[PDB]
Structures are given as structure tokens and as C-alpha cells.
Amino acid sequence: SRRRVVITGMGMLSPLGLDVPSSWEGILAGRSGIAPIEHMDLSAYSTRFGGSVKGFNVEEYLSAKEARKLDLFIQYGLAASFQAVRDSGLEVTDANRERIGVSMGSGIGGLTNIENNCRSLFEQGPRRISPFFVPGSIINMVSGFLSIHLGLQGPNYALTTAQTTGTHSIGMAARNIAYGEADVMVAGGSEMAACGLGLGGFGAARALSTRNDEPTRASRPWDRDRDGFVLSDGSGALVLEELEHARARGARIYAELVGFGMSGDAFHMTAPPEDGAGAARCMKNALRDAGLDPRQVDYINAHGTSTPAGDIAEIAAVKSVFGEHAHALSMSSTKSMTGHLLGAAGAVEAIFSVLALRDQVAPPTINLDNPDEGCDLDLVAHEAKPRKIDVALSNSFGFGGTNGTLVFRRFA
Template sequence: MTKRRVVVTGLGCIAPVGNTVAESWTNLLAGQSGIDTITSFDASPFACKFAGEVKGFDITQYISEKEARHMDRFIHLGMAAAIQAVQDSGLKTNDALSPEEATRIGCNIGSGIGGLPMIEATHGELVARGPRRVSPFFVPASIINMISGHVSIKYGFQGPNIAVVTACTTGLHAIGLSARMIEYGDADVMVAGGAESTVSPLGIGGFAAARALSTRNDDPKTASRPWDKDRDGFVLGEGAGVVVLEEYEHAKARGAKIYAEVSGFGMSGDAYHMTAPNVDGPRRSMTAALVNAGVNADEVQYLNAHGTSTPLGDLNETNAIKNTFGAHAKKLIVNSTKSMTGHLLGGAGGIESVFTVLALHHQKSPPTINIFNQDPECDLDYCANEARDLKIDVAVKNNFGFGGTNGTLVFKRA
């Protein structure tokens, strides 16, 4: 079977830097950090007291208060981003769809951890008041596939209804696997991405105990500093990013605006360590994506990196990029938007794919902020501290996760 072309026709984003795609993009280009002292709970006893929280978000702008009560916050964020993306795409929904059309639209919106705040709160209720006080909505409010489920129900989308869970590669894998479904005929349209909301006592406590988080409590806005010599760990963030993927001829036939083409997708496993990175796994993921796209390494101009601001991870990704792109690595613009959003875990690949598509669409690279003293071992062009106009025909997006899971997407200019 001939592989069908897949394009991006809708974008949605709820992020620490903005509650819409336009607001987020404007703030990214301006180098505005969304990271600050935690407000959702008292973080004073914790080693890390700051995060990239979503601010001023009101789920009742998207769904009813009654519906919202039966969902964890990660579902709220994912639903809102999906609704934005569907509206942006101009897709028909519900009764406007024919029975056949409804079966050709699917959902694949994942999360790395799921309803952690709901689990924490319900456990507290169980301990304090006993098992009869556990809500009958607890399980569907917490499980990861319920973003896809709720979006499907809201819009009458009866195609594939799944959710990917691959730690910090979740959102990217969801988009890549959804593109594959369209390429090989399982669907004509997929609503895909990732969401996360783990800025909570257990979320902060768990990552802090693993010594993964920055502890730069005196200056949160400069704490996420990918490729800086003084980086000391990642900053936890929350939010969601969702794209509408569509078969090219289907999009053309309905006159949809096309942001970019998803031309390649690669995956790999390190088979190395639970949490420590390995250079060869990311290299194989990037190489597989380029081969799948039919793109030579020297045809790529922009790479939105995983770039978490961890001492080992940033160096590892730099070396993997150099091993993949050879001499051309020095000509790439390599960018980490995590410097402004923090690390959204399962939501990272969602929002960062949105940002990569916007970089292609607007021909601009956002800055990597907080590079005050670039690590000499991290010796690529990271678009330090200021956005840059850039001719981008091909862009690459990386995400990597615990367990040695790696994913790479290749986007082409529409």
C-alpha cells in the first residue's frame, strides 16, 4: 500500500507561557519565562519550590462545571488544547458528520503519569474518612485514556480511540503513531498530543528525591537553562499540546489551512538504564525519522530538542545530534523551549510539536533563554537568548523518556 501524506491542520496549546497558541508563541519569541514559585500547594518543605504552572486557566470556558468536576486537571488541560485544535482546524463534528466520516476521525492524546493530584487527594480522603468516601468517578477521572475518550464523546469521533504512555516521549509518540495510522489508512484525521499536570506534592517530591530537579529557588525564572554550564536539573511544568493531523487530499478537498507536513517519524529504545540517557538510542531515533522522511541530514535547518537542562541529558543529546548530523550539526539551529515552559513530561512532545510547527510556519526560531555561560562541551548553535528569523524547510523534533524510550518527528514546510 502506498503511504499517504499527512499534514497538520489544527493547533491547540495550554502552557505555562500562555493559554492559547497565539499567546504562547508571542511569549516564547519574547523570551518570557513561565516558571515561578509554586502556588497550587505549599512547597516550602520541598527542595524545589518552583515550577512551570498554567496560570489563569478556566476549564468552564471549554466544558461545563458539572463535567469538569469528574476529571483530574490533566484531563482539563488536554480537553482544552484538543478543543482549541479542533476549532482551529475547522473540522465538522457531531451531526454535521456523516456516519462514514465519523468513523474516519480518531483521538490519541496521552499522558506520562495521568491523574496524580486526583490520586493524592482521593488517598487522603480514603485515609481520613474511609472507603465509603471514595468517589465513584475516581477511576475515570484519573486514567490516562480519558482525554481521548472525552474528546471522542464531545465531537462524535468514532475512529481509533487510544492513548500512548511513554513517559516524556508520550506526546511525540502519540503524534507520530497517529500519523502512521493515517498513512496506512486506519483514519483520515487524528486529534493527537499529550497532557500533564503533576505539579503536586508527590510529583515535586518524587522528582526532587531522584535529584532530577533544579533547586535554584532564589531565581526560578533562570532555573531552566539548557546547555548552560551551571544547569542543575529540569523544572517541572504542566500543560497540554494537541494537533489535528489529516490526510493531505482530505485536507485539500475541504479547503483546510495547512501548517506543515509530518514527513517522518522514528523510534528507538536504549536498552541501557531506567533513567540515565544513552547516546546511541537518540541517534538511531533521529536517523530512523530522517530515513522515513526521505530527508538527508544536510536538508534540516531547525531542531527543537528535548533539552531538559539536566547535566547529563543535555550533553547526551548534543553528542547524539553530532553523531546523527555529522559536520552539518554545526549549521543547525538547536532550540529548547523548555527553558521557558519547564518540562511537561508526557505533555512535552505535544506543546513542543506545536512550537516546532509554528517555527516552520512563521520561519522563526524561539530563543533558548538562560544561556549565560554555555557549556563548552555543548558546542552547537542553541539560538541563545534571542529569537531569530530563519529559513526553515525541514524541522526535527526530539523527545526522550525514562526507560530508554526515544522519538523523533520530521516536519516539512507546507
């Protein structure tokens, strides 16, 4: 019968820092992680900036021998996983290793490695493709490499649901624990799509902000002058643990994961419906799953991508789900500061939602200078808002009309 699930460890790489506490201090100070991209020549691209991870040292985590074989998205997922496991204080043993699994996902996976090997294939031929090309590029290898290095023999898998990946990964990992398939899961996501194909591909769809001359102002969710999402890199991982397992070992518990929802829009490959009907179905599934009155929701970490249609669909969904309470809760997009970490978005945003509970503060939506038509909720414009938060909701919506919602609450 269904067990309770708590958060005992968290780990992160983001455009604002190389761990959770540095990232969160940036979030609460309203600091932007967005800057011109330095790692390649973007002069022929319509977008030349994004949220890069700055000064990542893989030799904090892995031998340069192992690290050379792995795409950056895998390096980033392993860094966040290692941080989360250490933060949890969990000791892996012969007695518990079969009950500890991993579900670390990615939206796009090893696009840089595939680009570089494509360059070798076309310029020099197939014999120059890396022997490590496949295991170094495919999305399940965060889960694989983490399991090999820590000795995790529990459920081992990976989700890929585009921009919903991190939220779905955490939710489904919680279901694993809830239903008795594992006692512990490391779950979240990682992304590093800042290569020619990534910036070029999103560029070809005209989905990216082209505010090259003021990158820190590009990501402006619900602002009338928004002109698309900002592409960002990084990773979030959480250690999810059955409640009595966490209590038995004296774990520090950050918060409880009480609700998880999923829905499909069944509308369009890339565009969200204007009314947010799919997002609303998803949130309602999540709140019913958590046994909550919608009026209990104090904080929403929005998907809030800074796209014309996505930002307004989310207002419509929140008004539909919460009615008059939509005017009492606080809703913010941390993507205003971090940009859009795609498959990692839901994982870092789940961590920001847990810290909003820990610290009783709503992170700001920076750059919200002129809220658009109908964007009249408390969107925590400009500056962090200390307030009561018992229940926090984290939303993600992706290509293919795939929606996820996570519901967290304080644990006492």
C-alpha cells in the same frame, strides 16, 4: 499504500499562555513561564517552583458539572483538543465520524486526583473515595471524553511513554492516517504532575533544579550551571489529516509531518547514555522515514531538559547524526522558557516546531549564559533567530530509554 499527513489545527495550554498564539508570542520574546507554585504549601520540598498554567478557565470548554469529575490533566487535554479541532475548521458528520480518532496521552496522568482520593481513603475510609475516581484519573479519558463530546468513532487510544508521550502520540497517530486506519486524528499529550507526589517523587530522585531564589533562571539547557529540569503543566494537541482529505475540504495546512522515528536506548531506567547512541538511532530512523538528506534539517527543537547528562547526550547525538552540518542547523530548547511538560513536552514542542516553519524563526534557548564543555553548536542563545527553515525536527527522550523524533517540513 502510505498516504501523506498534514497539520490543519493546533491547541495548547502552557506556562506562557492559554492558547497557541499567546504561548508562541511568549516563546519568541524569550519570556519565562516559571514561578513559585501557589496552589499548595511546598515549604518542606527541595523545589518550590515550576511552570503552572495561569488562569485556566475550564468553563470555556466544559460545564462545571462535567469538569468537577475530571483531573486537571484531563481538563488540560480537552482544552487543547477543543482548540485544535476548532482551529482545523473540520466539521464532524455521520459521513466522516468513523474516520476521525484521537490519541491524547500523559506520562503520569491523574496524580493530583489520586493524591486527594488517597487523603480521603486514609483519613475517612473507602466510602469517601469519589465515584468518578477511576474514569476521572486514568490516562485514556482525554481520548474517551473528547470522543463522547465530539462524536469521534475512529481509533481511540492513549500512549504513556513518560517524557516521550507527546511525540510518540503524534507520530503513531500519523501512522494511523498514513496506513488508512483513519483520515483525521487529534493527537498530543497533557500533564499536571505538580502535586506533593510529583514534586516529592522527582525531588527524591534529585532530578529537579533547586534554584528556588531565581525560578526564571532555573531551566538553563546546556548552561554549565544547570542543576536539573523544571516541572511544568499543560497540553498540546494537533489535528493530523490525510493530505487529499485536507485538500478536498480547502483546509489551511500549517506544515507536513514527513518523518517519525522511535528507538530504545536499552541502557538505564532514568539516565540517557553519555554518547546519545539511542537518540542518534531515533533521528536517523526519522530522517530515513522522511526520505531526507540530514543536511536538509534547518531547525531542531531539542528535548533539552536542563539535566547535566541529558543536555550533553543530545549534543553528542546531533553531532553523530549531522557531522559537519551540525554546525549549520539551529537547535534550541523551548524548555528554557516553558520547563518540562513531561508527557505534554513533545506535543507543545511539535506545535513550536510547526510555528518555527510558519514564521521562519528559531526560538531561543534562554539562560544559556555559559555553554558547557562541548556545547558549541548554534543553540540560539538568549534571542529568537529569524532564518530559513524548510525542515524542523522535534526530539523527546524518556525514562525507560524511550526515544521519539518527529520531522516536519513546509507545505506548498
